[model samples]
Target: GTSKLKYVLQDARFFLIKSNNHENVSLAKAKGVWSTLPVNEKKLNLAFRSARSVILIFSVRESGKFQGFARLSSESHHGGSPIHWVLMLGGVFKIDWICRRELPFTKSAHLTNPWNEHKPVKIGRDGQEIELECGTQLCLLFPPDESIDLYQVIHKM
Candidate 1:
């Protein structure tokens, strides 16, 4: 019974939400998904739906850094092309700057911008946007940390 229910967390996926403005960042957490961009909505839909958790990071106009994290429920809602995309979420939490450095990045070979980079986080892959524009969000897939200290203590009101 309990073991079967744990099937969801067993396959935890990590994603990164890099936004341009704080409003859109707030909107994404308040709403579900942020506004769309020149990037393909179909591909984003595919990634988010499969992801169980999303890391919240943003760039306000120019300067950027890590903001927080989120846990998404299964089954994300897809809208029209470059129109709308909503992530079915369970909770959105705030990640402190202290804990941000402790995450494991070596596990993910897909990361384009390293976690320690001074610039904003960007995951480059085929068909994904290399650079992010204003008023839009990038939901790039991140690697999961399976360490013993991988705790779930970040939660915001």
Candidate 2:
């Protein structure tokens, strides 16, 4: 008798973390660890304590592209920087490319996952909104198309 392997992922909410450098993301994906930048400490720590998975998305200019996802296993506050947080991740998966255009758009509280746009974004010294390029923030995706089975896509990755 042959044993058939069945792949699956647990159903849970996830987060999207945008980055400007592909090299940094690649290294994190390979090592299953990532150090995040200064962000909303309360919200960021809340997410770090949640059971949700964190995915890495790369952004050039302002647009973002999803490459893969992973779950945060551990975290530590670096003494060097007050807000520097390091996260140990596991169950990393890289899937086929999907851009912002491929997903459904919605406001917070209505979707399976909440959109970060509704959340407060960090500001600079001059009271200007910090751009996503330098801000390591948590973003949640909205409900996608029925045809797009995210779990199936994740299984293949």
Candidate 3:
């Protein structure tokens, strides 16, 4: 059977993206994921500056087994900045995963330094199913200068 999960942000500030209908595209072709809401540069800057990282909590019904998780990053290589995404799982056992992708861009009066590529990391168990507790926390990290955004989905088998 398939299950659907909804994540609630603990802090309103971390709730940047309001809509849930954004298209699911390939990690290789995604521009930075930004909010559809009209946000001023100042607000964006505040969110970027004040946030160490964003935490998303996924609640599953009937203890759906955990297959794995993937990391997705952005493809914006501007201002000589490289961006990457990191995922951290919290529980009795903790796991950290980094995206493996690099993007570099250069143009007149602009150059992007060597940066981490935006990619997704998948975490899955073997034949055995791993049940995620009712409330599980997933941490998303955006390294400085990458100006990229991220999204995540939990699946069942």
Candidate 4:
């Protein structure tokens, strides 16, 4: 099912980078966790004014920490799509996939690299959270204590 990000509170760490090299959080108005899908681009100007082909988002931890961020865009994809590729490699997470959603911009941030082998997902201590370790980065997908973690971390970052 291709669901939209409508009514999504979109609370998360956000950022934007313009072509001119001018970049900043405010420049993109990073959100709790929001990105511009084609439809959303019209709602926010950073997608156009910033002239940034991509934007990023990260989830907040209960301890007011950010574990990971994703790259996203509103541009239409008629050819080989980035999100489509990830979903194919996302394994069981393929079902966790949502069309038009933003993911971390970094190659390492992607759950699966095009040419790299798949990495196993590690369950948190309480088995209530999902995590992925990429290179030297730790990506915490979702946790039971989202409010205590994402709520606080989204603002702190």
lDDT for every model? 0.35, 0.35, 0.22, 0.26
TM-score-based ranking, best first? Answer: 2, 1, 3, 4
What's the lDDT for candidate 2?
Answer: 0.35
Which sections of candidate 2 miss by over 4 Å? 1-11, 40-42, 52-64, 79-157
Q: How many clashes show up in model 1?
A: 0
- Model 3 segments more than 4 A misplaced: 1-13, 24-29, 40-42, 54-157
Greater lDDT among 2 and 3 belongs to 2
CA lDDT, candidate 3, residue 38? 28
lDDT of 2 by residue, 1-157 (tens): 0111012123222344555555655665445455544443334456545533333333322333344434444443443322222333222222222222222222222322223343432211211222232222223342222333345344433
Residue-level lDDT tens digits of model 4 in 3-104: 112112132212321211112222222222232233334423333243321223332223232333333333222333233111011111100111122223
| Error of model 4, residue 148, in angstroms | 29
| Model 4 TM-score, 2 decimals | 0.21
Which regions of candidate 1 deviate over 4 angstroms? 1-11, 38-40, 48-61, 74-157
- lDDT per residue as tens, model 3, 69-146: 222122112343232322121111111112212221111112111111211111221111111221122222212222
In angstroms, how far off is 114's CA in candidate 2?
4.8
For TM-score, the strongest prediction is 2
Residue pairs with colliding backbones in model 3 are 67-124, 68-123, 69-122, 69-123, 70-121, 71-120, 71-121, 80-112, 101-117, 102-117
